[PDB]
């Protein structure tokens, strides 16, 4: 995020880091339960990538992180790679995340909830903060 | 990539308003946010856009696409969860 700020550590508990086997972060995700993660379909996750939970500082080695294996990748079949529409994939964990003070789930909305233009929300992540 | 976790509060926009910036690339299962001085950028993809509702953070959007430049004057585009939750639920249900 550009123009962002540092979050309080562990304050967005559902926030997960998707990392390749090399350990390089390439995409974010959100735990919706102890067994499933929601992410963007275009991230192109595979069974070889890893779901990391409870992380704040990726440079730290003292964090009690949770490296979770990916059992199966459920790419929304309405996803359109040409147009990036329906960009959602579900990742089922092969090992359940252990919920805690720093690892918990985001709430999901009803199909009909209204979220008004003008409302101030929050987005988080480890993406570039400079382009 | 930065080492520690970042965040930013930003406004939701109407699809109709978005389209003044991204035309027809904007679909019903997408929701726009930003153009307010911060922007989602490479590496943020798949991450969340949440809103507070009845005091609980709720996944309204998933970081999808935006400025090739991460411009903070252009809005970010997010997958719209409301349009996706039905599939989310069937998927959990059968797996």
């Amino acid at each position: 995020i550009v123009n962002g700020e540092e979050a309080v550590p562990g304050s967005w508990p559902w926030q997960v880091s998707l990392q390749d086997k090399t350990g390089f972060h390439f995409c974010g995700g959100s735990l919706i339960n102890e067994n499933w993660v929601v992410t963007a379909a275009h991230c192109g996750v595979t069974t070889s990538d890893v779901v990391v939970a409870g992380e704040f500082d990726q440079g730290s080695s003292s964090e009690k992180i949770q490296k979770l294996k990916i059992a199966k990748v459920f790419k929304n079949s309405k996803y359109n790679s040409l147009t990036i529409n329906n960009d959602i994939t579900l990742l089922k964990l092969s090992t359940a995340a252990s919920f805690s003070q720093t690892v918990s789930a985001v709430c999901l909305p009803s199909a009909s909830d209204d979220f008004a233009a003008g409302t101030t929300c929050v987005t988080t992540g480890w993406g570039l903060t400079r382009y | 990539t930065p080492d520690r976790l970042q965040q930013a509060s930003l406004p939701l926009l109407s699809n109709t308003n978005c389209k003044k910036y991204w035309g027809t690339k904007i679909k019903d299962a997408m929701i726009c946010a930003g153009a307010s001085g911060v922007s989602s950028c490479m590496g943020d993809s798949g991450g969340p856009l949440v809103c507070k509702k009845n005091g609980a953070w709720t996944l309204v959007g998933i970081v999808s696409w935006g400025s090739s430049t991460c411009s903070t004057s252009t809005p970010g585009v997010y997958a719209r969860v409301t349009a996706l939750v039905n599939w989310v639920q069937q998927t959990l249900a059968a797996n």
């Binding site: 562990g10 508990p13 709430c107 | -």
Partner: peptide, 10 residues
């Protein structure tokens, strides 16, 4: 869901 144990500060 949706209520962190550690409160976010924005």
């Amino acid at each position: 869901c949706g209520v962190p144990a550690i409160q976010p500060v924005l």
